[PDB]
Amino acid sequence: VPAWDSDIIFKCLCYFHTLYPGLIPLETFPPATIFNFKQKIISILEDKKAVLRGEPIKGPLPICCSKENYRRHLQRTTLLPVFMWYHPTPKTLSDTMQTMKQLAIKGSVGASHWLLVIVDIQARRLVYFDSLYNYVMPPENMKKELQSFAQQLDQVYPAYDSKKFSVKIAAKEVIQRGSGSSCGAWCCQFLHWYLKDPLTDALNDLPVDSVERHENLASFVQACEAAVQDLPELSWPEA
Numbered sequence: 130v131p132a133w134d135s136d137i138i139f140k141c142l143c144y145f146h147t148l149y150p151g152l153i154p155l156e157t158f159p160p161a162t163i164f165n166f167k168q169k170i171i172s173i174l175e176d177k178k179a180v181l182r183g184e185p186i187k188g189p190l191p192i193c194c195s196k197e198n199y200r201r202h203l204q205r206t207t208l209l210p211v212f213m214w215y216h217p218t219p220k221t222l223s224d225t226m227q228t229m230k231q232l233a234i235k236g237s238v239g240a241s242h243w244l245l246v247i248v249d250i251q252a253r254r255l256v257y258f259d260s261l262y263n264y265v266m267p268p269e270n271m272k273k274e275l276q277s278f279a280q281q282l283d284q285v286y287p288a289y290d291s292k293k294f295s296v297k298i299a300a301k302e303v304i305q306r307g308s309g310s311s312c313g314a315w316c317c318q319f320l321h322w323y324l325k326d327p328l329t330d331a332l333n334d335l336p337v338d339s340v341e342r343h344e345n346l347a348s349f350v351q352a353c354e355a356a357v358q359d360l361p362e363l364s365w366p367e368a
């Protein structure tokens with residue numbers, strides 16, 4: 130399991146869209162951070178609302194998608210896959226990005242991490258997946274912050290019947306125990322299980338052995354690399 134950078138994660142999301150068209154393949158460059166992921170999601174869901182009323186979108190067009198295609202995505206999507214790039218040190222979005230840029234040139238992970246927040250529009254579910262279990266803060270604190278965020282989302286994107294957005298913390302233990310490179314791949318793997326089954330408890334079923342579980346993850350990665358080989362580069366699928 131090598132390191133999955135943003136480009137490979139994007140591709141894999143593109144591919145994921147062609148399998149599960151309700152997933153919008155949100156760009157990972159520049160990615161969401163722990164400082165702006167809320168605002169980014171709110172802005173996406175507001176643009177979705179505009180699209181449903183035939184109105185103009187306000188928020189920014191993706192770099193690799195036409196206006197027209199982005200409207201159709203927004204109309205069809207039932208699932209926002211938000212990839213969050215974390216490092217413990219930077220204390221602002223701009224610093225986070227600078228650190229991200231810096232760590233690319235040094236060509237190491239360092240202490241950097243990817244997190245996944247799934248905004249499941251259909252189930253009305255916020256799903257927080259950290260393969261390190263508590264790299265950003267404890268799961269219980271993160272749950273509480275997300276229950277707050279989930280209430281803003283009830284106001285921003287109301288349901289027909291006022292069903293409230295619920296929050297699940299995906300990882301109950303450290304998932305990527307004996308690997309410091311696998312966090313992108315884990316995030317895509319967890320995503321894929323979730324698409325296959327949103328009622329998944331795939332994480333609970335994992336083999337206890339850290340080697341076994343990363344062998345399986347490696348197969349996963351090979352299957353995806355094979356599956357996206359011929360797909361266009363830097364190019365959203367057409368919704």
Ligand SMILES: *C(=N)c1ncc(C(=O)NCc2ccccc2)cn1
Nearest residue numbers: 134232233238241242243309310312
């Ligand atoms: C998870 N194990 C993991 N997450 C993030 C990185 C990382 O960001 N490395 C530096 C980098 C490479 C390419 C583009 C931007 C940043 C590594 N590992």
